[PDB]
Swiss-Prot record:
GO terms for cellular component: viral outer capsid. The gene is S4. Gene3D superfamilies: Outer-capsid protein sigma 3, large lobe, Outer-capsid protein sigma 3, small lobe. A zinc finger (CCHC-type) spans 51-73. It comes from the Viruses. It holds the Pfam family Reovirus_cap. It comes from Reovirus type 1 (strain Lang). This is Outer capsid protein sigma-3. Heterohexamer of three sigma-3 and three Mu-1 proteins. The RNA-binding form is probably a homodimer. It is found in: Virion. Cleaved during virus the endosomal proteolytic disassembly of the outer capsid. Stimulates translation by blocking the activation of the dsRNA-dependent protein kinase EIF2AK2/PKR, thereby inhibiting the host interferon response. Sigma3 prevents the activation of EIF2AK2 by competing with the kinase for dsRNA-binding. GO terms for molecular function: protein serine/threonine kinase inhibitor activity; RNA binding; structural molecule activity; zinc ion binding. GO terms for biological process: regulation of translation; symbiont-mediated suppression of host innate immune response; symbiont-mediated suppression of host PKR/eIFalpha signaling; symbiont-mediated suppression of host type I interferon-mediated signaling pathway; viral life cycle. InterPro entries: Reo_capsid_sigma3, Reovirus_capsid_sigma-3_dom_sf.
Amino acid sequence: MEVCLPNGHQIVDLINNAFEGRVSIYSAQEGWDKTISAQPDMMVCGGAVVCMHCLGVVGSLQRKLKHLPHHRCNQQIRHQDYVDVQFADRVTAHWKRGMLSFVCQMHAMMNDVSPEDLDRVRTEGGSLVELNWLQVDPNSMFRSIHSSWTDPLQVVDDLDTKLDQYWTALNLMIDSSDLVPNFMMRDPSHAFNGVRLEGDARQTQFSRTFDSRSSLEWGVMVYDYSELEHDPSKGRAYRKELVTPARDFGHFGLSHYSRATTPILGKMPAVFSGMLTGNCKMYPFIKGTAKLKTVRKLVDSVNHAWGVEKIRYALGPGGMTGWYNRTMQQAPIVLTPAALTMFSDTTKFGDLDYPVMIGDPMILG
């Protein structure tokens, strides 16, 4: 056996899928499965098949593998060296299911509207549908304390498909109706920095990162649209005229800005792409530079494990360190789903007029 070490691009690729929850991993206990936890042995990286315990190039795409033959290994790789990545993706699975079930609940509630009250609100405004956040999946690590990352996951299929269906249907029903909920955002940059806080919101802090060093179990933070409904000088007419995100995005069938909500799960506000690209997609804002910070200990370890020739020949000039820094330059763009630039920049009802606090979810006009 003559194992080798891969190249930068595929590493970035693996980094991305880590925040994409789409990596194919093998584990004889689970084989392909990842619903439950167990140590890994081989993983894919930008199209390559790698050992997880000598981290050598053991294959690629055009040929699948089924089991590990006796190969030339080093067995110097530890769990904490990589626990971070499957850690983050287990987080991904959690949070994706959470936002998913959220959407399911929301469209289900929407799936109950009758025309009479409908027209009454259209003529009047006010609340239409309200939801209790306490009853929203306590089992989630965003909602339970005895739970953990390692907890085996829940099985669903074509989550993307159903997601898009329901985001589509729901926001279209709103579009026809032109309502305004207190849990949506036009510039989520404000969320972790750029918002006004009030009430127990004075007590929330920010890590901006996947970190077991922060509790993500938490309530859900929304606007204060109560007085908004109360405001007669900005009444039903005005309410339609300025606050409807058609002002901020136009038709939901005219998607050219990305659509974000408040920090729903674990203080995380996610955004939606535009279907006029073919389809819409949810994404939690994650800084690529953080993902860079992850690989640092690995740089060290490999410095310690392997020779200068290989790194000049595997991660090239400046070694993987020069790779680190040049990629560190490249980051703000090479790490960018397009929605990361689909932002809106004019709110026509103001936002620092309304604080954010943990209350019961709802949509009003």
